[model samples]
Target: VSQETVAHVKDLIGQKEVFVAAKTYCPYCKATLSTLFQELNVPKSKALVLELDEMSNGSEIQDALEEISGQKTVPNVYINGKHIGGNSDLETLKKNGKLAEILKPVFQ
Candidate 1:
């Protein structure tokens, strides 16, 4: 939880409509990422994810996210700078048929 890590994540999150800071080895990350792309309105889109497990400083960033958001899990999903939870949380939303409604603001 360093200043630089927070700054870096803020910069990345601020620059995109949807930013998924994820881990390559995390099952939650994979499932949530795939669902994000499939469920969200994105083809020519701003939804982007970085595979943290692939990069050198990715773990550091994850640590920063944990400190900043208090969610100690991969697939750190952010939409318009909002933390909407991870795979199971999102899947629950999808199951409740509230996914598209929730994403409308971001889509617009």
Candidate 2:
């Protein structure tokens, strides 16, 4: 979680339609999120998984995560710099048909 990397991520969040910064090891969460993004036709480049080594620098990434999300956890999903919580929260959004709304602004 270098400052440079986090800054890069912030740039992506501002630029991409859907930004998912997750971990590859969390297969369950990762697979579910992958499917959801795919179902929404989200491009592969827009979703990202930070390597474990990258997340080890907790201070750098955690600070950025807190600044952006106010919480330090893997699978931090941001739609246009808006913190949308983790997997369960995203599931709720999908169930309630709110996910599309959150993503709509980025499309335009």
Candidate 3:
């Protein structure tokens, strides 16, 4: 049941330039999404966001995320197929200008 889910997740990230495995009610996810769309100006077309809590297979996706990212939490972020960690981690990158750098290839 879940190996398929894992492969589905892999395919998803492989196909998208930016991806976020998130939950609707999680503040971290909210903050990350808000920053990505509002602050950084990443277009909705450029990002793939999954509100995992809304999916029937949310738990499985979370498991797949943990298996692939070594992070067992919501708001898992990826850019250009690279893992970018959580909200605070994203803030750190933004603080150091790396966020802009990372997004330049696709967004700028």
Candidate that scores best on TM-score: 3
| Regions more than 4 Å wrong, model 1 | none
Off by over 4 Å in 3: none
Tens-digit lDDT string for candidate 2 (1-108): 567767865775666556666666676457557655666766556655455445566346556776665766766777766777778788889889998787675455
Greater TM-score among 1 and 3 belongs to 3
Candidate 1 or 3, higher lDDT? 3
What's each prediction's TM-score? 0.85, 0.68, 0.93
lDDT of 1 by residue, 1-108 (tens): 779879887788767777888876688887887787865545437777888878898888888888778988877877778777788888888899877677777767
Error at 100, model 2, angstroms: 2.2
Comparing candidate 1 with candidate 2, which one achieves the higher lDDT?
1
Kindly report which residue pairs in candidate 2 clash with one another. Answer: 1-54
Local distance difference test values of all predictions, in order: 0.78, 0.65, 0.88
lDDT of 3 by residue, 1-108 (tens): 368878888888767778999997798899999898888889888889988889998888889989887899879999998999999999999999999989997765
Q: List the residue pairs that clash in candidate 1.
A: none
Candidate 1's TM-score reads 0.85
State the lDDT at 49 in candidate 2.
47
Q: Say which prediction, candidate 1 or candidate 2, comes out ahead on TM-score.
A: 1
- Give candidate 3's error at residue 59 in angstroms: 0.9
